[PDB]
């Protein structure tokens, strides 16, 4: 159970984004139904009044939280991967539009899942804004918690992989559009019951064997990481 509080750009807090520039759902409950429209931008997908201005090469940092800002972030039981996608705002997330900018699942040398590291990072994980066409975008951050993903939701609706999905309205101002945005995938649609990484048993299978759901990260993606960039408590 987790939600996005807001974002930072180049290490500078853009302020509380909830229902402002984040298309916030009313609570931190997971989405589980892979075929639901809720998979796109969670259960209250609508245009919110602000969109965060950025330029290509900027560092865009999502900040997540559990109940209050900079708390325990997400329950440590929720081991799983983290991905970030982008689509043009004109789509409203419909169609084959989502392009993957970041993937992190399991890190063998630290023996930590992405979620484990997110907690350590005070909820913060980042992407570098790519050289796409200037305009309005949705950046869709997705945490998948696997602690009940030995079952499929389609078969047993009280279990299944849990998706914490958040869409930020982002305006890209300065960019040379030298890596124009390619073909992406649909949500809902990309993840099905057979997709690698959707059904997995974290209690018996080694994490080193885990493969995250495709698609793979776009070659045009400029970077990213799970790591605290800013100290919320200083505000
Ligand atoms: C999953 O979502 C689909 C698409 O909206 C819907 O038809 C189906 O009833 C949902 N499953 C459950 C258990 O609600
Ligand atoms: Cl509810
Ligand atoms: Cl659901
Ligand atoms: Cl605005
Ligand atoms: Cl708070
Ligand atoms: Cl960190
Ligand atoms: Cl540029
Ligand atoms: Cl980064
Ligand atoms: Cu939860």
- Kindly give, in sequence order, each residue whose CB lies less than 8 Å from that of residue 226, ignoring residues fewer than 6 positions away: 82, 104, 114, 117, 118, 121, 124, 125, 126
Question: Does residue 91 have its Cβ closer than 6 Å to ligand 1?
Answer: no
Pairwise CA distance, residues 111 & 210, whole Å = 12
Q: How far is the CA of 30 from the centre of ligand 2 (A)?
A: 10
Nearest CA to ligand 1 atom 8: 36
Nearest CA to ligand 1 atom 14: 33
Q: How far is the CA of 72 from the centre of ligand 6 (A)?
A: 14
Range of the domain at 210: 2-235
In DSSP terms, 166 is beta-bridged to: 141
Question: Does residue 154 have its Cβ closer than 6 Å to ligand 1?
Answer: no
Decide if 151 contacts 160 (C-beta within 8 A). yes
Residues in the chain: 235
Alpha-carbon dihedral sign for residues 179, 164, 46, 189:
positive
Q: How was it solved?
A: X-ray
Q: Is 108 exposed, middle or buried (0-12, 13-18, 19+ CB in 10 A)?
A: exposed
Q: How far is the CA of 41 from the centre of ligand 4 (A)?
A: 19
Tokens 């809720």 belong to residue: 38
Nearest CA to ligand 1 atom 3: 36
Is cis: bond before 215, omega within 30 of 0? yes
**Closest C-alpha among 126, 130, 226 to residue 184:** 130
Q: What share of the chain is helix, strand, coil (3-state, %, to 5)?
A: 10, 30, 60
Pairwise CA distance, residues 164 & 144, whole Å = 6
Q: What is the tally of structural domains in the chain? A: 1
Q: This structure's resolution (angstroms)?
A: 1.9
Determine the Cα angle at 115 with ends 111 and 121, to 5°.
95
In this structure, what CATH number is given to the domain that contains residue 233?
2.70.50.70
Residue to mutate, 36, 43, 45, 159, ligand 1, most ligand atoms under 8 Å from C-beta: 36
Tokens 């909830």 belong to residue: 18
Question: Does residue 92 have its Cβ closer than 6 Å to ligand 1?
Answer: no
The string of DSSP letters for 141-209 reads: EEEEE-TTTTS-TTT-TTSS-EEEEEEEEEEE-S----S-----B-TTTS--TTSTTTS--TTTS-GGG
Pairwise CA distance, residues 69 & 56, whole Å = 28
Helix (H) or strand (E) holding 117: helix 114-120
Cα→Cα distances 109→65, 112, 113, 200, 223, Å: 26, 8, 11, 21, 20
Burial code of 178-213, b = ≥16 C-beta within 10 A, e = fewer?
A: ebebeebbbbbebbeeeeebbbbebeeeebeebebb
Q: How far is CA 105 from the centre of its chain?
A: 12
Greatest extent of the chain over all pairs of C-alpha atoms, in Å: 48
Pairwise CA distance, residues 174 & 149, whole Å = 41
Q: How far is the CA of 158 from the centre of ligand 8 (A)?
A: 36
Q: How far is the CA of 73 from the centre of ligand 6 (A)?
A: 13
Nearest CA to ligand 1 atom 9: 36
């Amino acid at each position: 159970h987790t939600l996005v509080w807001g974002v930072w750009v180049n290490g500078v807090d853009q302020g509380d984004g909830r229902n402002i520039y984040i298309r916030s759902p009313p609570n931190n409950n997971p989405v589980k139904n892979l075929t639901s429209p809720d998979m796109t931008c969670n259960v209250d997908n609508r245009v919110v009044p602000k969109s965060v201005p950025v330029n290509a090469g900027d560092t865009l940092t999502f900040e997540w939280y559990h109940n209050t800002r900079d708390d325990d972030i997400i329950a440590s039981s929720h081991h799983g991967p983290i991905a970030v996608y982008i689509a043009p705002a004109a789509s409203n997330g419909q169609g084959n539009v989502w392009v993957k900018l970041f993937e992190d699942a399991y890190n063998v040398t630290n023996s930590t899942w992405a979620v484990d590291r997110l907690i350590t990072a005070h909820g913060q994980h980042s992407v570098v804004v790519p050289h796409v066409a200037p305009g309005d975008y949705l950046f869709r951050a997705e945490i998948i918690a696997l602690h009940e993903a030995d079952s499929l939701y389609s078969q047993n609706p009280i279990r299944g992989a849990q998706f914490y999905i958040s869409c930020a309205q982002i305006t890209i101002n300065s960019s040379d559009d030298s890596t124009p945005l390619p073909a992406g995938v649909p949500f809902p649609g990309a993840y099905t019951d057979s997709t690698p990484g959707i059904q997995f048993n974290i209690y018996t299978t080694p994490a080193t064997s885990y493969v995250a759901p495709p698609p793979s990260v776009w070659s045009g993606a400029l970077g990213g990481s799970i790591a605290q960039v800013g100290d919320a408590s200083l505000e």
